[PDB]
């Protein structure tokens, strides 16, 4: 079975080097090329370089000074090193197998982030439902944490209908933030307790917040 397994960390400090080992099985590196591609969010697939089957390498012009591509045949491994990363390098980094015509088998990817931020638990704030709202909306603001991810439930999984947990956003500070919102009927705000359950495993931070109407 043809497979490509990427190892190496997602997180690189600014001005530090991104290292990704691409380990393979069920094909020979002597007989195939390994291509290195990245996908910035919203932008398209970007080719960075290749270890051809013969053992000679090639690079995209804009990365010539930043890239190293070596390989170890006996280990079934090709190695990728890019230097001096900045925020504009935030992407999924792919090793992919080249056959005659195309990139026919792909590594699972490596989600790469650039930050000098240290692990931080989030402050959770209530987004209290409007004094005159029919449907009402309420939520929790989950602010200033690193790294991703946080998970949010409502009343411990009991409330799932209308619940939208937004993709996190990276602030000027290097800290992530998101909102978890839920729509409920206006007539229940005096009648039912609504609690966001917030969990950030890397800071081992659990926190419940009751969202009290205004």
């Amino acid at each position: 079975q043809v497979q490509l397994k990427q190892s190496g960390p997602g997180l690189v400090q600014p001005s530090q080097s991104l290292s990704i080992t691409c380990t393979v099985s069920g094909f020979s590196l002597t007989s195939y090329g390994i291509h290195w591609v990245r996908q910035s969010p919203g932008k398209g697939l970007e080719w960075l370089g290749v270890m051809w089957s013969g053992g000679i390498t090639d690079f995209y012009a804009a990365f010539i000074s930043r890239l190293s591509i070596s390989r170890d045949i006996s280990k079934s491994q090709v190695f990728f090193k890019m230097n001096s990363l900045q925020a504009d390098d935030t992407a999924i980094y792919y090793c992919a197998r080249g056959s005659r015509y195309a990139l026919d088998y792909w590594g699972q990817g490596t989600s790469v982030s650039v930050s000098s931020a240290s692990t931080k638990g989030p402050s959770v704030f209530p987004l209290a439902p409007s004094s005159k709202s029919g449907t009402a909306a309420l939520g929790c603001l989950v602010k200033d944490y690193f790294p991703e991810p946080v998970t949010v439930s409502w009343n411990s999984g009991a409330l799932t209908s209308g619940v939208h947990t937004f993709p996190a956003v990276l602030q000027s500070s290097g800290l992530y933030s998101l909102s978890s919102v839920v729509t409920v009927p206006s007539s229940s705000l005096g009648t039912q307790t609504y609690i966001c359950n917030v969990n950030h495993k890397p800071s081992n931070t659990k926190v419940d917040k009751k969202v009290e109407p205004k």
Partner: peptide, 10 residues
């Protein structure tokens, strides 16, 4: 989920 697959070539 970010997994990539070749569909068709040439």
């Amino acid at each position: 989920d970010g997994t990539v697959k070749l569909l068709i070539y040439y």
